Amino acid sequence: CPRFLKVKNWETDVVLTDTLHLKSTLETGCTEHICMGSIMLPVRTKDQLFPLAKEFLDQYYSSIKRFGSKAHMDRLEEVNKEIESTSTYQLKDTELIYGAKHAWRNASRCVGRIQWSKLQVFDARDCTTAHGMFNYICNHVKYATNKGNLRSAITIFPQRTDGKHDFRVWNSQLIRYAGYKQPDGSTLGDPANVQFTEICIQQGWKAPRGRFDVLPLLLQANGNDPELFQIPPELVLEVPIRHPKFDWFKDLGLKWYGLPAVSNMLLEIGGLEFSACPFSGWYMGTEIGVRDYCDNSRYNILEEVAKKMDLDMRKTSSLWKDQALVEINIAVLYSFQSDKVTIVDHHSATESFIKHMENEYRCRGGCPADWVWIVPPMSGSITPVFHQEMLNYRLTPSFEYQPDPWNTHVW
Ligand code: HEM
Ligand SMILES: COCCCNc1cncc(CCc2cc(C)cc(N)n2)c1
Ligand SMILES: C[C@H](O)[C@H](O)[C@H]1CNc2nc(N)[nH]c(=O)c2N1
Ligand SMILES: [Zn+2]
């Protein structure tokens, strides 16, 4: 802008002023001579820990307008001494909830953040076993699902200590379908999960060898060998995909699960690392309809579908893929709604995100947003976020990526 940063919506000419980026700690990958905005992915000593701890506490106490208080100050000595003795420290329940809700709030890749303050935090820091993990996770799933009226939730397992005793949910999501490679060449189910399916089988999973087989949970507690568990099927809500007009759509036998629940990410609060912190909300229809169903590397159903629309697949210029994609996504939304399972369309979601974005600038002086991820993978320019300039930067607490457990743990 003039002296501090401005973003603009070119459809509405609204301008917003960003000051929040000046708090940004972490680094983006971009430099003054290269932009890495479209790049997917650009323990800790005692000494590294206290700055990060104090930085978080200062923020937490500044959030409740008690910055610089006795409570604030004693808490600082309290934690400083915890780190000398024990090389770590423990978050109060209140701080844990603040941290978690704010990690969501700072998640620059998430279009749903208008919901950020409405999150259930299940503290599972007392868990010591894979079995306990299974119990916490089942409870999360059942709570979150809520018989179709979805509720946002996260379950936080014990924090990392010496890198030799961390909790990992080896699953990328709590609920995902298996993927089966064949020397036939082809692949049955979800190909994103083929290797993971292999690990499960090479750990004794009795694979039904079907298309939409819900995978077992594979749970690592205290750094031990991970252990298999079948989520109770009655806890796994699913939607058969049919079309509001094309009654032949049922015949494709599509089904998806209703509960999107990410389980491979790392939650960072006050320098502490929670390597097992599965979290869930509800689906934007395009996640299933466009990416899950139509990505070439995923279920890849575009050919099968468009074929059954008497479509012109001779050349790409008929836009037969575009047509099939729109129908597939209509069927997804219709289905979830006919089943009274929470879902949002990309028009409504992006619309609420603009509102949220403007909310955040009003009261927080900004909102970090990653345009590349915020814009839906179909019909981009007819949603409001396509035309909205966005500033991306890294605030903390945060959810981070982390290595796949099978490329580390062994024995
Ligand atoms: C309530 C409904 C929610 C909706 C509609 C929603 C929507 C989305 C969408 C569409 C994406 C992009 C995913 C993709 O295209 O692969 C995403 C990413 C993400 N969401 Fe949200 N979300 C919701 C709830 C939550 C919650 C409860 C959390 C955590 C507290 C969260 C944190 C994140 C994070 C960390 C990412 C980035 C994933 C990555 O970088 O791989 N979201 N969200
Ligand atoms: C490939 O490396 C990065 C992995 C991409 N992340 C990613 C992939 N598929 C699905 C997701 C689900 C994201 C999500 C999470 C939540 C809590 C809700 C929602 N609607 N969507 C995330
Ligand atoms: C290359 C590019 O960064 C990558 O394909 C991104 C683009 N935008 C995305 N946006 C969402 N919501 N989800 C994704 O997986 C991706 N993939
Ligand atoms: Zn950049």
Side-chain angles (χ1 to χ4, degrees), residues 243 246 248-249 289 294 301-303 305-307 309-313 315-331 378-379:
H243 194 282
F246 308 154
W248 54 259
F249 210 91
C294 296
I301 77 185
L302 282 169
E303 276 132 347
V305 169
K307 149 133 299 205
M309 288 180 79
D310 294 331
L311 256 176
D312 183 31
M313 260 143 294
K315 213 110 225 195
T316 70
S317 197
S318 72
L319 306 196
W320 60 266
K321 293 194 175 173
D322 301 69
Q323 254 172 334
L325 203 180
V326 171
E327 297 307 323
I328 291 169
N329 280 76
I330 286 184
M378 67 169 297
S379 321

PDB file of all heavy atoms in Angstrom, residues 243 246 248-249 289 294 301-303 305-307 309-313 315-331 378-379:
ATOM      1  N   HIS A 243     -27.470 -39.197  -7.941  1.00  0.00           N
ATOM      2  CA  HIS A 243     -27.658 -37.916  -8.619  1.00  0.00           C
ATOM      3  C   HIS A 243     -29.116 -37.502  -8.531  1.00  0.00           C
ATOM      4  O   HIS A 243     -29.995 -38.339  -8.628  1.00  0.00           O
ATOM      5  CB  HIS A 243     -27.260 -38.060 -10.083  1.00  0.00           C
ATOM      6  CG  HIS A 243     -27.093 -36.760 -10.805  1.00  0.00           C
ATOM      7  ND1 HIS A 243     -28.160 -36.012 -11.255  1.00  0.00           N
ATOM      8  CD2 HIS A 243     -25.979 -36.087 -11.181  1.00  0.00           C
ATOM      9  CE1 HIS A 243     -27.712 -34.931 -11.864  1.00  0.00           C
ATOM     10  NE2 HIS A 243     -26.391 -34.950 -11.829  1.00  0.00           N
ATOM     11  N   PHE A 246     -30.080 -37.875 -12.665  1.00  0.00           N
ATOM     12  CA  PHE A 246     -29.621 -39.054 -13.381  1.00  0.00           C
ATOM     13  C   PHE A 246     -29.689 -40.251 -12.446  1.00  0.00           C
ATOM     14  O   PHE A 246     -28.830 -40.440 -11.577  1.00  0.00           O
ATOM     15  CB  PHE A 246     -28.196 -38.859 -13.898  1.00  0.00           C
ATOM     16  CG  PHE A 246     -27.997 -37.596 -14.679  1.00  0.00           C
ATOM     17  CD1 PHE A 246     -26.745 -37.002 -14.744  1.00  0.00           C
ATOM     18  CD2 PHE A 246     -29.053 -37.002 -15.352  1.00  0.00           C
ATOM     19  CE1 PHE A 246     -26.545 -35.833 -15.467  1.00  0.00           C
ATOM     20  CE2 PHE A 246     -28.862 -35.829 -16.078  1.00  0.00           C
ATOM     21  CZ  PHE A 246     -27.609 -35.249 -16.135  1.00  0.00           C
ATOM     22  N   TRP A 248     -29.209 -43.181 -13.140  1.00  0.00           N
ATOM     23  CA  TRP A 248     -28.168 -44.140 -13.487  1.00  0.00           C
ATOM     24  C   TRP A 248     -26.904 -43.903 -12.670  1.00  0.00           C
ATOM     25  O   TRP A 248     -26.006 -44.750 -12.638  1.00  0.00           O
ATOM     26  CB  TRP A 248     -27.841 -44.084 -14.984  1.00  0.00           C
ATOM     27  CG  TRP A 248     -27.490 -42.712 -15.493  1.00  0.00           C
ATOM     28  CD1 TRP A 248     -28.308 -41.862 -16.179  1.00  0.00           C
ATOM     29  CD2 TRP A 248     -26.226 -42.036 -15.368  1.00  0.00           C
ATOM     30  NE1 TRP A 248     -27.638 -40.701 -16.481  1.00  0.00           N
ATOM     31  CE2 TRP A 248     -26.361 -40.782 -15.993  1.00  0.00           C
ATOM     32  CE3 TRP A 248     -25.000 -42.368 -14.783  1.00  0.00           C
ATOM     33  CZ2 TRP A 248     -25.319 -39.860 -16.046  1.00  0.00           C
ATOM     34  CZ3 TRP A 248     -23.967 -41.451 -14.837  1.00  0.00           C
ATOM     35  CH2 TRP A 248     -24.133 -40.212 -15.463  1.00  0.00           C
ATOM     36  N   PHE A 249     -26.819 -42.742 -12.030  1.00  0.00           N
ATOM     37  CA  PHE A 249     -25.645 -42.432 -11.230  1.00  0.00           C
ATOM     38  C   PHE A 249     -25.398 -43.447 -10.108  1.00  0.00           C
ATOM     39  O   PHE A 249     -24.254 -43.834  -9.874  1.00  0.00           O
ATOM     40  CB  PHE A 249     -25.717 -41.023 -10.667  1.00  0.00           C
ATOM     41  CG  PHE A 249     -24.378 -40.402 -10.474  1.00  0.00           C
ATOM     42  CD1 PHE A 249     -23.804 -39.640 -11.484  1.00  0.00           C
ATOM     43  CD2 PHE A 249     -23.670 -40.597  -9.295  1.00  0.00           C
ATOM     44  CE1 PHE A 249     -22.555 -39.068 -11.315  1.00  0.00           C
ATOM     45  CE2 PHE A 249     -22.425 -40.028  -9.117  1.00  0.00           C
ATOM     46  CZ  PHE A 249     -21.859 -39.262 -10.132  1.00  0.00           C
ATOM     47  N   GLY A 289     -15.851 -34.469  -4.592  1.00  0.00           N
ATOM     48  CA  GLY A 289     -16.288 -34.484  -5.975  1.00  0.00           C
ATOM     49  C   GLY A 289     -15.226 -34.208  -7.036  1.00  0.00           C
ATOM     50  O   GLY A 289     -15.226 -34.839  -8.098  1.00  0.00           O
ATOM     51  N   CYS A 294     -11.885 -37.153  -9.028  1.00  0.00           N
ATOM     52  CA  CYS A 294     -11.474 -36.840 -10.400  1.00  0.00           C
ATOM     53  C   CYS A 294      -9.978 -36.643 -10.655  1.00  0.00           C
ATOM     54  O   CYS A 294      -9.538 -36.751 -11.810  1.00  0.00           O
ATOM     55  CB  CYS A 294     -12.294 -35.677 -10.963  1.00  0.00           C
ATOM     56  SG  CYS A 294     -14.059 -36.059 -11.129  1.00  0.00           S
ATOM     57  N   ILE A 301     -12.538 -41.004 -11.920  1.00  0.00           N
ATOM     58  CA  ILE A 301     -13.806 -41.526 -12.423  1.00  0.00           C
ATOM     59  C   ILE A 301     -14.384 -40.748 -13.609  1.00  0.00           C
ATOM     60  O   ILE A 301     -15.429 -41.122 -14.141  1.00  0.00           O
ATOM     61  CB  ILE A 301     -14.844 -41.565 -11.305  1.00  0.00           C
ATOM     62  CG1 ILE A 301     -15.389 -40.163 -11.042  1.00  0.00           C
ATOM     63  CG2 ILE A 301     -14.230 -42.159 -10.033  1.00  0.00           C
ATOM     64  CD1 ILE A 301     -16.347 -40.092  -9.871  1.00  0.00           C
ATOM     65  N   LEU A 302     -13.706 -39.672 -14.011  1.00  0.00           N
ATOM     66  CA  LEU A 302     -14.156 -38.831 -15.128  1.00  0.00           C
ATOM     67  C   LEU A 302     -14.519 -39.618 -16.388  1.00  0.00           C
ATOM     68  O   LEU A 302     -15.590 -39.410 -16.951  1.00  0.00           O
ATOM     69  CB  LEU A 302     -13.139 -37.724 -15.451  1.00  0.00           C
ATOM     70  CG  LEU A 302     -13.151 -36.523 -14.494  1.00  0.00           C
ATOM     71  CD1 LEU A 302     -11.955 -35.599 -14.703  1.00  0.00           C
ATOM     72  CD2 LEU A 302     -14.445 -35.733 -14.605  1.00  0.00           C
ATOM     73  N   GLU A 303     -13.645 -40.526 -16.816  1.00  0.00           N
ATOM     74  CA  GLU A 303     -13.917 -41.332 -18.007  1.00  0.00           C
ATOM     75  C   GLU A 303     -15.197 -42.148 -17.854  1.00  0.00           C
ATOM     76  O   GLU A 303     -16.094 -42.086 -18.697  1.00  0.00           O
ATOM     77  CB  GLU A 303     -12.745 -42.268 -18.314  1.00  0.00           C
ATOM     78  CG  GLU A 303     -11.615 -41.632 -19.110  1.00  0.00           C
ATOM     79  CD  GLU A 303     -10.250 -41.918 -18.508  1.00  0.00           C
ATOM     80  OE1 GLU A 303     -10.198 -42.399 -17.350  1.00  0.00           O
ATOM     81  OE2 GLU A 303      -9.232 -41.659 -19.190  1.00  0.00           O
ATOM     82  N   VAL A 305     -17.718 -41.860 -15.873  1.00  0.00           N
ATOM     83  CA  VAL A 305     -18.901 -41.012 -15.760  1.00  0.00           C
ATOM     84  C   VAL A 305     -19.353 -40.402 -17.087  1.00  0.00           C
ATOM     85  O   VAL A 305     -20.518 -40.522 -17.464  1.00  0.00           O
ATOM     86  CB  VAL A 305     -18.667 -39.866 -14.761  1.00  0.00           C
ATOM     87  CG1 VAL A 305     -19.789 -38.832 -14.850  1.00  0.00           C
ATOM     88  CG2 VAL A 305     -18.530 -40.416 -13.348  1.00  0.00           C
ATOM     89  N   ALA A 306     -18.433 -39.736 -17.779  1.00  0.00           N
ATOM     90  CA  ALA A 306     -18.772 -38.980 -18.979  1.00  0.00           C
ATOM     91  C   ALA A 306     -19.224 -39.922 -20.083  1.00  0.00           C
ATOM     92  O   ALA A 306     -20.031 -39.555 -20.951  1.00  0.00           O
ATOM     93  CB  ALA A 306     -17.584 -38.151 -19.441  1.00  0.00           C
ATOM     94  N   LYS A 307     -18.678 -41.137 -20.045  1.00  0.00           N
ATOM     95  CA  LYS A 307     -19.059 -42.187 -20.970  1.00  0.00           C
ATOM     96  C   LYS A 307     -20.559 -42.370 -20.853  1.00  0.00           C
ATOM     97  O   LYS A 307     -21.282 -42.330 -21.847  1.00  0.00           O
ATOM     98  CB  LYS A 307     -18.292 -43.478 -20.650  1.00  0.00           C
ATOM     99  CG  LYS A 307     -19.041 -44.762 -20.960  1.00  0.00           C
ATOM    100  CD  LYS A 307     -18.170 -45.759 -21.717  1.00  0.00           C
ATOM    101  CE  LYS A 307     -17.705 -45.185 -23.050  1.00  0.00           C
ATOM    102  NZ  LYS A 307     -17.379 -46.243 -24.052  1.00  0.00           N
ATOM    103  N   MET A 309     -22.881 -40.459 -20.125  1.00  0.00           N
ATOM    104  CA  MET A 309     -23.694 -39.258 -20.339  1.00  0.00           C
ATOM    105  C   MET A 309     -23.925 -39.030 -21.824  1.00  0.00           C
ATOM    106  O   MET A 309     -24.314 -37.934 -22.235  1.00  0.00           O
ATOM    107  CB  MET A 309     -23.024 -38.012 -19.750  1.00  0.00           C
ATOM    108  CG  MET A 309     -23.012 -37.928 -18.241  1.00  0.00           C
ATOM    109  SD  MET A 309     -22.196 -36.425 -17.629  1.00  0.00           S
ATOM    110  CE  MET A 309     -23.494 -35.213 -17.866  1.00  0.00           C
ATOM    111  N   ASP A 310     -23.669 -40.070 -22.620  1.00  0.00           N
ATOM    112  CA  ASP A 310     -23.717 -39.993 -24.083  1.00  0.00           C
ATOM    113  C   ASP A 310     -22.837 -38.849 -24.593  1.00  0.00           C
ATOM    114  O   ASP A 310     -23.164 -38.194 -25.581  1.00  0.00           O
ATOM    115  CB  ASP A 310     -25.163 -39.844 -24.590  1.00  0.00           C
ATOM    116  CG  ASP A 310     -26.022 -41.078 -24.308  1.00  0.00           C
ATOM    117  OD1 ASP A 310     -25.465 -42.193 -24.242  1.00  0.00           O
ATOM    118  OD2 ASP A 310     -27.255 -40.934 -24.158  1.00  0.00           O
ATOM    119  N   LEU A 311     -21.714 -38.633 -23.911  1.00  0.00           N
ATOM    120  CA  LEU A 311     -20.870 -37.464 -24.146  1.00  0.00           C
ATOM    121  C   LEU A 311     -19.881 -37.624 -25.294  1.00  0.00           C
ATOM    122  O   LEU A 311     -19.589 -38.736 -25.733  1.00  0.00           O
ATOM    123  CB  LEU A 311     -20.121 -37.078 -22.866  1.00  0.00           C
ATOM    124  CG  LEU A 311     -20.663 -35.854 -22.126  1.00  0.00           C
ATOM    125  CD1 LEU A 311     -19.918 -35.594 -20.817  1.00  0.00           C
ATOM    126  CD2 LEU A 311     -20.591 -34.642 -23.035  1.00  0.00           C
ATOM    127  N   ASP A 312     -19.358 -36.494 -25.757  1.00  0.00           N
ATOM    128  CA  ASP A 312     -18.404 -36.469 -26.862  1.00  0.00           C
ATOM    129  C   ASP A 312     -16.954 -36.464 -26.370  1.00  0.00           C
ATOM    130  O   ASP A 312     -16.367 -35.406 -26.160  1.00  0.00           O
ATOM    131  CB  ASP A 312     -18.659 -35.246 -27.751  1.00  0.00           C
ATOM    132  CG  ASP A 312     -17.755 -35.209 -28.963  1.00  0.00           C
ATOM    133  OD1 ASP A 312     -17.374 -36.291 -29.453  1.00  0.00           O
ATOM    134  OD2 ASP A 312     -17.426 -34.100 -29.425  1.00  0.00           O
ATOM    135  N   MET A 313     -16.382 -37.655 -26.212  1.00  0.00           N
ATOM    136  CA  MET A 313     -15.023 -37.813 -25.700  1.00  0.00           C
ATOM    137  C   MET A 313     -13.950 -37.828 -26.791  1.00  0.00           C
ATOM    138  O   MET A 313     -12.778 -38.083 -26.501  1.00  0.00           O
ATOM    139  CB  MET A 313     -14.928 -39.095 -24.868  1.00  0.00           C
ATOM    140  CG  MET A 313     -14.993 -38.871 -23.367  1.00  0.00           C
ATOM    141  SD  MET A 313     -15.891 -40.152 -22.468  1.00  0.00           S
ATOM    142  CE  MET A 313     -17.533 -39.880 -23.127  1.00  0.00           C
ATOM    143  N   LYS A 315     -12.709 -35.310 -28.697  1.00  0.00           N
ATOM    144  CA  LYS A 315     -11.740 -34.255 -28.450  1.00  0.00           C
ATOM    145  C   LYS A 315     -12.039 -33.596 -27.112  1.00  0.00           C
ATOM    146  O   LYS A 315     -13.165 -33.663 -26.624  1.00  0.00           O
ATOM    147  CB  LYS A 315     -11.775 -33.215 -29.565  1.00  0.00           C
ATOM    148  CG  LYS A 315     -10.415 -32.592 -29.845  1.00  0.00           C
ATOM    149  CD  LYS A 315      -9.882 -33.050 -31.198  1.00  0.00           C
ATOM    150  CE  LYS A 315      -8.416 -33.450 -31.128  1.00  0.00           C
ATOM    151  NZ  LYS A 315      -7.809 -33.552 -32.488  1.00  0.00           N
ATOM    152  N   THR A 316     -11.030 -32.953 -26.531  1.00  0.00           N
ATOM    153  CA  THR A 316     -11.162 -32.299 -25.225  1.00  0.00           C
ATOM    154  C   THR A 316     -11.940 -30.993 -25.334  1.00  0.00           C
ATOM    155  O   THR A 316     -12.327 -30.395 -24.329  1.00  0.00           O
ATOM    156  CB  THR A 316      -9.779 -31.977 -24.622  1.00  0.00           C
ATOM    157  OG1 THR A 316      -9.156 -30.926 -25.376  1.00  0.00           O
ATOM    158  CG2 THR A 316      -8.888 -33.210 -24.649  1.00  0.00           C
ATOM    159  N   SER A 317     -12.154 -30.554 -26.571  1.00  0.00           N
ATOM    160  CA  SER A 317     -12.777 -29.266 -26.836  1.00  0.00           C
ATOM    161  C   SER A 317     -14.295 -29.263 -26.622  1.00  0.00           C
ATOM    162  O   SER A 317     -14.909 -28.205 -26.521  1.00  0.00           O
ATOM    163  CB  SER A 317     -12.439 -28.793 -28.248  1.00  0.00           C
ATOM    164  OG  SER A 317     -12.720 -27.421 -28.334  1.00  0.00           O
ATOM    165  N   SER A 318     -14.894 -30.445 -26.548  1.00  0.00           N
ATOM    166  CA  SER A 318     -16.290 -30.563 -26.141  1.00  0.00           C
ATOM    167  C   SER A 318     -16.473 -30.255 -24.642  1.00  0.00           C
ATOM    168  O   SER A 318     -17.600 -30.160 -24.161  1.00  0.00           O
ATOM    169  CB  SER A 318     -16.798 -31.973 -26.422  1.00  0.00           C
ATOM    170  OG  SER A 318     -16.229 -32.882 -25.497  1.00  0.00           O
ATOM    171  N   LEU A 319     -15.366 -30.103 -23.914  1.00  0.00           N
ATOM    172  CA  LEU A 319     -15.399 -29.890 -22.462  1.00  0.00           C
ATOM    173  C   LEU A 319     -16.161 -31.004 -21.736  1.00  0.00           C
ATOM    174  O   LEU A 319     -16.805 -30.767 -20.706  1.00  0.00           O
ATOM    175  CB  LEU A 319     -15.971 -28.509 -22.097  1.00  0.00           C
ATOM    176  CG  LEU A 319     -15.285 -27.305 -22.765  1.00  0.00           C
ATOM    177  CD1 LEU A 319     -15.615 -25.971 -22.076  1.00  0.00           C
ATOM    178  CD2 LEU A 319     -13.785 -27.507 -22.837  1.00  0.00           C
ATOM    179  N   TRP A 320     -16.076 -32.222 -22.261  1.00  0.00           N
ATOM    180  CA  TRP A 320     -16.790 -33.354 -21.657  1.00  0.00           C
ATOM    181  C   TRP A 320     -16.330 -33.609 -20.220  1.00  0.00           C
ATOM    182  O   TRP A 320     -17.125 -34.021 -19.370  1.00  0.00           O
ATOM    183  CB  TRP A 320     -16.668 -34.627 -22.510  1.00  0.00           C
ATOM    184  CG  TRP A 320     -15.254 -35.103 -22.706  1.00  0.00           C
ATOM    185  CD1 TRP A 320     -14.422 -34.803 -23.752  1.00  0.00           C
ATOM    186  CD2 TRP A 320     -14.498 -35.949 -21.826  1.00  0.00           C
ATOM    187  NE1 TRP A 320     -13.201 -35.415 -23.579  1.00  0.00           N
ATOM    188  CE2 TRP A 320     -13.224 -36.125 -22.406  1.00  0.00           C
ATOM    189  CE3 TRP A 320     -14.776 -36.578 -20.605  1.00  0.00           C
ATOM    190  CZ2 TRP A 320     -12.232 -36.906 -21.806  1.00  0.00           C
ATOM    191  CZ3 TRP A 320     -13.793 -37.357 -20.015  1.00  0.00           C
ATOM    192  CH2 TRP A 320     -12.537 -37.513 -20.614  1.00  0.00           C
ATOM    193  N   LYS A 321     -15.053 -33.350 -19.940  1.00  0.00           N
ATOM    194  CA  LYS A 321     -14.539 -33.505 -18.572  1.00  0.00           C
ATOM    195  C   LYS A 321     -15.174 -32.476 -17.656  1.00  0.00           C
ATOM    196  O   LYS A 321     -15.490 -32.764 -16.523  1.00  0.00           O
ATOM    197  CB  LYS A 321     -13.014 -33.343 -18.510  1.00  0.00           C
ATOM    198  CG  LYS A 321     -12.201 -34.422 -19.203  1.00  0.00           C
ATOM    199  CD  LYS A 321     -10.733 -34.348 -18.797  1.00  0.00           C
ATOM    200  CE  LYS A 321      -9.937 -35.503 -19.392  1.00  0.00           C
ATOM    201  NZ  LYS A 321      -8.466 -35.358 -19.152  1.00  0.00           N
ATOM    202  N   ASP A 322     -15.334 -31.261 -18.160  1.00  0.00           N
ATOM    203  CA  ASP A 322     -15.900 -30.170 -17.384  1.00  0.00           C
ATOM    204  C   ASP A 322     -17.332 -30.476 -17.000  1.00  0.00           C
ATOM    205  O   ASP A 322     -17.750 -30.220 -15.867  1.00  0.00           O
ATOM    206  CB  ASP A 322     -15.864 -28.895 -18.209  1.00  0.00           C
ATOM    207  CG  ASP A 322     -14.457 -28.526 -18.621  1.00  0.00           C
ATOM    208  OD1 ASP A 322     -13.884 -29.256 -19.449  1.00  0.00           O
ATOM    209  OD2 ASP A 322     -13.911 -27.546 -18.072  1.00  0.00           O
ATOM    210  N   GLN A 323     -18.075 -31.017 -17.964  1.00  0.00           N
ATOM    211  CA  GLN A 323     -19.470 -31.369 -17.770  1.00  0.00           C
ATOM    212  C   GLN A 323     -19.631 -32.456 -16.714  1.00  0.00           C
ATOM    213  O   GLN A 323     -20.357 -32.275 -15.755  1.00  0.00           O
ATOM    214  CB  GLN A 323     -20.125 -31.782 -19.088  1.00  0.00           C
ATOM    215  CG  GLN A 323     -21.047 -30.723 -19.614  1.00  0.00           C
ATOM    216  CD  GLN A 323     -21.548 -31.028 -20.991  1.00  0.00           C
ATOM    217  OE1 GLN A 323     -20.899 -31.736 -21.765  1.00  0.00           O
ATOM    218  NE2 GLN A 323     -22.717 -30.497 -21.315  1.00  0.00           N
ATOM    219  N   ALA A 324     -18.929 -33.564 -16.908  1.00  0.00           N
ATOM    220  CA  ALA A 324     -18.930 -34.674 -15.981  1.00  0.00           C
ATOM    221  C   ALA A 324     -18.540 -34.235 -14.573  1.00  0.00           C
ATOM    222  O   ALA A 324     -19.105 -34.719 -13.606  1.00  0.00           O
ATOM    223  CB  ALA A 324     -17.997 -35.773 -16.468  1.00  0.00           C
ATOM    224  N   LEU A 325     -17.586 -33.311 -14.471  1.00  0.00           N
ATOM    225  CA  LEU A 325     -17.119 -32.840 -13.185  1.00  0.00           C
ATOM    226  C   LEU A 325     -18.231 -32.083 -12.465  1.00  0.00           C
ATOM    227  O   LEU A 325     -18.446 -32.275 -11.259  1.00  0.00           O
ATOM    228  CB  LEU A 325     -15.867 -31.960 -13.350  1.00  0.00           C
ATOM    229  CG  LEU A 325     -14.891 -31.778 -12.178  1.00  0.00           C
ATOM    230  CD1 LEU A 325     -13.734 -30.863 -12.573  1.00  0.00           C
ATOM    231  CD2 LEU A 325     -15.574 -31.187 -11.012  1.00  0.00           C
ATOM    232  N   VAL A 326     -18.932 -31.220 -13.192  1.00  0.00           N
ATOM    233  CA  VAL A 326     -20.043 -30.492 -12.585  1.00  0.00           C
ATOM    234  C   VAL A 326     -21.139 -31.440 -12.058  1.00  0.00           C
ATOM    235  O   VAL A 326     -21.585 -31.298 -10.917  1.00  0.00           O
ATOM    236  CB  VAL A 326     -20.634 -29.428 -13.513  1.00  0.00           C
ATOM    237  CG1 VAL A 326     -21.900 -28.868 -12.923  1.00  0.00           C
ATOM    238  CG2 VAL A 326     -19.651 -28.316 -13.692  1.00  0.00           C
ATOM    239  N   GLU A 327     -21.549 -32.411 -12.875  1.00  0.00           N
ATOM    240  CA  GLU A 327     -22.533 -33.413 -12.447  1.00  0.00           C
ATOM    241  C   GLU A 327     -22.098 -34.206 -11.203  1.00  0.00           C
ATOM    242  O   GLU A 327     -22.830 -34.250 -10.213  1.00  0.00           O
ATOM    243  CB  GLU A 327     -22.881 -34.358 -13.600  1.00  0.00           C
ATOM    244  CG  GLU A 327     -23.537 -33.666 -14.785  1.00  0.00           C
ATOM    245  CD  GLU A 327     -24.751 -32.832 -14.395  1.00  0.00           C
ATOM    246  OE1 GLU A 327     -25.516 -33.236 -13.490  1.00  0.00           O
ATOM    247  OE2 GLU A 327     -24.935 -31.757 -14.994  1.00  0.00           O
ATOM    248  N   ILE A 328     -20.912 -34.813 -11.260  1.00  0.00           N
ATOM    249  CA  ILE A 328     -20.305 -35.481 -10.105  1.00  0.00           C
ATOM    250  C   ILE A 328     -20.384 -34.643  -8.847  1.00  0.00           C
ATOM    251  O   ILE A 328     -20.789 -35.125  -7.788  1.00  0.00           O
ATOM    252  CB  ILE A 328     -18.840 -35.853 -10.358  1.00  0.00           C
ATOM    253  CG1 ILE A 328     -18.768 -36.967 -11.396  1.00  0.00           C
ATOM    254  CG2 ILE A 328     -18.174 -36.333  -9.077  1.00  0.00           C
ATOM    255  CD1 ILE A 328     -17.369 -37.216 -11.888  1.00  0.00           C
ATOM    256  N   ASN A 329     -20.023 -33.375  -8.946  1.00  0.00           N
ATOM    257  CA  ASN A 329     -20.128 -32.524  -7.768  1.00  0.00           C
ATOM    258  C   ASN A 329     -21.547 -32.159  -7.308  1.00  0.00           C
ATOM    259  O   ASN A 329     -21.763 -31.879  -6.129  1.00  0.00           O
ATOM    260  CB  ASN A 329     -19.245 -31.299  -7.917  1.00  0.00           C
ATOM    261  CG  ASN A 329     -17.809 -31.618  -7.613  1.00  0.00           C
ATOM    262  OD1 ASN A 329     -17.109 -32.225  -8.426  1.00  0.00           O
ATOM    263  ND2 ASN A 329     -17.378 -31.274  -6.414  1.00  0.00           N
ATOM    264  N   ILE A 330     -22.498 -32.152  -8.241  1.00  0.00           N
ATOM    265  CA  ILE A 330     -23.906 -31.953  -7.911  1.00  0.00           C
ATOM    266  C   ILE A 330     -24.428 -33.146  -7.099  1.00  0.00           C
ATOM    267  O   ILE A 330     -25.188 -32.987  -6.129  1.00  0.00           O
ATOM    268  CB  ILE A 330     -24.763 -31.762  -9.205  1.00  0.00           C
ATOM    269  CG1 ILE A 330     -24.515 -30.374  -9.802  1.00  0.00           C
ATOM    270  CG2 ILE A 330     -26.255 -31.936  -8.927  1.00  0.00           C
ATOM    271  CD1 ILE A 330     -25.361 -30.054 -10.995  1.00  0.00           C
ATOM    272  N   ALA A 331     -24.000 -34.335  -7.515  1.00  0.00           N
ATOM    273  CA  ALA A 331     -24.433 -35.586  -6.924  1.00  0.00           C
ATOM    274  C   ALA A 331     -23.913 -35.734  -5.487  1.00  0.00           C
ATOM    275  O   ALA A 331     -24.604 -36.275  -4.609  1.00  0.00           O
ATOM    276  CB  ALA A 331     -23.979 -36.754  -7.784  1.00  0.00           C
ATOM    277  N   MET A 378     -12.491 -26.208  -8.744  1.00  0.00           N
ATOM    278  CA  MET A 378     -13.391 -26.045  -9.885  1.00  0.00           C
ATOM    279  C   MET A 378     -14.084 -24.688  -9.810  1.00  0.00           C
ATOM    280  O   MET A 378     -14.178 -24.100  -8.727  1.00  0.00           O
ATOM    281  CB  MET A 378     -14.406 -27.197  -9.991  1.00  0.00           C
ATOM    282  CG  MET A 378     -15.451 -27.303  -8.864  1.00  0.00           C
ATOM    283  SD  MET A 378     -16.769 -28.505  -9.264  1.00  0.00           S
ATOM    284  CE  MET A 378     -17.484 -27.738 -10.717  1.00  0.00           C
ATOM    285  N   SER A 379     -14.529 -24.179 -10.960  1.00  0.00           N
ATOM    286  CA  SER A 379     -15.262 -22.909 -11.041  1.00  0.00           C
ATOM    287  C   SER A 379     -14.632 -21.740 -10.266  1.00  0.00           C
ATOM    288  O   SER A 379     -15.344 -20.867  -9.771  1.00  0.00           O
ATOM    289  CB  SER A 379     -16.709 -23.102 -10.581  1.00  0.00           C
ATOM    290  OG  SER A 379     -17.238 -24.341 -11.033  1.00  0.00           O
TER     291      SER A 379
END
